[PDB]
Symmetry: C3
Subunit: 350 residues, 3 copies
Amino acid sequence: ALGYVTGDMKELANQLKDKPVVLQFIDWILRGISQVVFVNNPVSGILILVGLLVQNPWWALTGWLGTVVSTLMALLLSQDRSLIASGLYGYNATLVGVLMAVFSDKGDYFWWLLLPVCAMSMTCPIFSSALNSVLSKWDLPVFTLPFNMALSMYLSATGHYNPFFPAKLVIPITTAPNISWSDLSALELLKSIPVGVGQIYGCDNPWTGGIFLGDILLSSPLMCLHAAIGSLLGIAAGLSLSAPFENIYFGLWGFNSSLACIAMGGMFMALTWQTHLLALGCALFTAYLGVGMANFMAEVGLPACTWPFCLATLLFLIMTTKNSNIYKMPLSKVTYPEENRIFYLQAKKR
Amino acid sequence: ALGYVTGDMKELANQLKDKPVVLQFIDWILRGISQVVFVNNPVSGILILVGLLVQNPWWALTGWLGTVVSTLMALLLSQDRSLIASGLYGYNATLVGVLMAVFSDKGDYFWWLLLPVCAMSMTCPIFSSALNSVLSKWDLPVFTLPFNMALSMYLSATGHYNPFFPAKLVIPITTAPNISWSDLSALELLKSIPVGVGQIYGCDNPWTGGIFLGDILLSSPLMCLHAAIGSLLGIAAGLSLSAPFENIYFGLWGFNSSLACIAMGGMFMALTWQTHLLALGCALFTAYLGVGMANFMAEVGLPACTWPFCLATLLFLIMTTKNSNIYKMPLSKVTYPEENRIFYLQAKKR
Amino acid sequence: ALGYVTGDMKELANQLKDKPVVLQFIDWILRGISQVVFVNNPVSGILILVGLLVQNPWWALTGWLGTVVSTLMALLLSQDRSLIASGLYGYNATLVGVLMAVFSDKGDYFWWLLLPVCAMSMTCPIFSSALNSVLSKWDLPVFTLPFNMALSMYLSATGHYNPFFPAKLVIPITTAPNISWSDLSALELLKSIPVGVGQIYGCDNPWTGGIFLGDILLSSPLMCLHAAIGSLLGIAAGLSLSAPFENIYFGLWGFNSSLACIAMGGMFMALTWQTHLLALGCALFTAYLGVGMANFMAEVGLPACTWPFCLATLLFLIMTTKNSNIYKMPLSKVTYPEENRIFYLQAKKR
């Protein structure tokens, strides 16, 4: 019974292909919710929704509405049904809605915020279309670029001083932090791993991050392992640059690295120990680029939400090596690390 | 007699191909002036010049000098005569000169400003060359990217504190605007449409915008309709985000949207009602991206002049749909919406 | 005997192909040091190292360590041995190390700085890989983009307020400079040419720039001439915009232009008088873009080290002309201007 919910849930999709369209749309919405962490499982989407509800029901509502609007717009714009049914046209809008709720300065259940959310969700397919047409020619996935572009556009358009939809103030660092290294807590550092995973959706509740890790583990255990290791490497990188302890603890240092480790640790490159080590290196590089872009975009009053992960993973995927054990997965054969490794071994034998 | 001046004026070009080179150069300069609004009519160029003279003779002189210098440099750099005769190597420099005069802090008829203008005009062909070589491989036009690149370079090089050519101060918003919604004027909002069209050349005179609309209407009425609707949609987008009423009244919200509506409303995509609605959506998206980039580049002390229109239109042209009624025109068959629709219908029949 | 050390030193490479690997690695390190100024001569690398030692032994040590780490990482990542033996995987890291030492606020011989340097050096091959895979499809070289990307990442990650590795404060201009044109010194302006060449490695000692010019002259005299002329054109461009005389005297205006003149003056385009004039124009454009990006990135607290040269040279190489005398060299036939001209003449005859 457990095998029916593990992986991409191909059997459920095959059964739903001959069912009423409403159930299919619900499945697509759940897969879109899950695809933020490169998971194509509707049950993982339900678990991520439960985690968001544990963190903040307002954020869950906004993200669900964004996903629904994006999927409907993708159907209206006549995009590929294969990518809609896999939730590839609804995860950027899930992030857009959730992070629009997060970066709002107005208060929870500010209903007017639903109007820009919808407005910023219909733009998600367009981005996800154009970028795909640009990147599919290099066999590169469009990781989270639509969400980052849409959110940067929104938060630049509104800012902190908008009378309708003010955004939170992003102030650049002006004084050198005072760090007491005798007050470093091992328990808080350990909690920073699930919190780092949860910050992919902008959540700081450790339970939300744990539920996200469980949702990822439902699909593929290696993805969960790589998410945890990426969060840990983000913590290490934060300690390396003497970041404020509160920031590491809140997970700000380990969600970009977690996403990079998930992407490079078996998903978009075949899982070998060489690829595992290079995924750890990519996670460290992503954490460093994350603090770099955070400081950069604090000068323009913007948060560098997931730009670090996108740029670092694209850099590490474009990079070419003469090593046969470092294999870039074809974009039509990327399902999840366990299946990707089988495909890679079969290709290596032939 | 009216039919000799409507459209691209092919008959005049055919007659001028066997005339002295000076008259041909004047025709190329006028076509370059007109091609800012995607018009290839020398009479439309004369009308736009008259509008600029109505607004400010200094701006008209600077733009004319920029166009002349760019066309001469394109001839010197041995570029395609077909693109020079169509004014595609002189409109970016027209914008460069006019907006250099606009963003100057020195005073009208500051003759020394002609030296950087020329300097910033010879760079326009180079950009217009390279970008074309980059974008013609995707069958994408280079809308106004050379002008935006050149003007950003110039205004970053000089700034407000240059002893020779100071630029106007671009200050980011620091206080939330106080908007009295009982003082909204319908007459000012209605005037904001022609002013929005006129702000394509940086002009705020309603008569200048009216003359620009007449020049566009001389070539193709659908282009004029789309310019007006784009300006109106920019006004609506400004009202949506509670922009200061003076910014809407000045047309700062409706020239990027007007250009986007012109480009997407029959010029670079065949005019169907689906394409018309998507052009309206592109205009709204362009207005929102316009305020976003204005706020972004106010942090670096720069105006986001026409970057919004370029980026939004490129995004909407790269985006692919499985809808046969949403047709992207081949770049070798783009003349103006009336002819593009005939071409599209003939292709659809076959 | 002089002919054995002129040019790319092909005979030494052929002899070293059958020697112990340590000597080969030393040769690769020296060629990487030299390849910052597009020179593939180990003796030129020794001369550049002597110049760096004259300026600051700490900077020389840091750059040498960066080059060694990058070459070792490129060998580990299984990159092309042809590009490693030519030093194309070690010059970006040489610049990274030297400029990390330059932009450090801690003090000379701050040994902990070696840890980020190594960390920022292993990223240099990755960049140099990915960018190459992106740009080799347009037959475009990756000039210094890896170093600029790595240094921007590092200086954004650390900033001026990092407790471990603070960076120097980059403050944007806030007051209009007071320039006394009666105090312009011809001797200081003349010294600004070798200092401008030396600022390619971040050095301001005129003797260091002279040694760099001698190292370039050892390989190809035309490269030295173009470096000097590019520095002079940067000085002229600085005088054109009323830059502070101390900035010109420090060579901050003439290293991007010098690199652009070297690249366009016979290296990546065949040397004709048309190409020479266009290389001078590229140098002027590069100086103007240099001040533009310096002012731009001072708003984000970053130095625009070599971004101007990279972007300007890429723009001038992408640009296409119908002039047969403006020839872009194939990237597999680029050795140095004297040989490139012979290749171009042979191609022209056939």
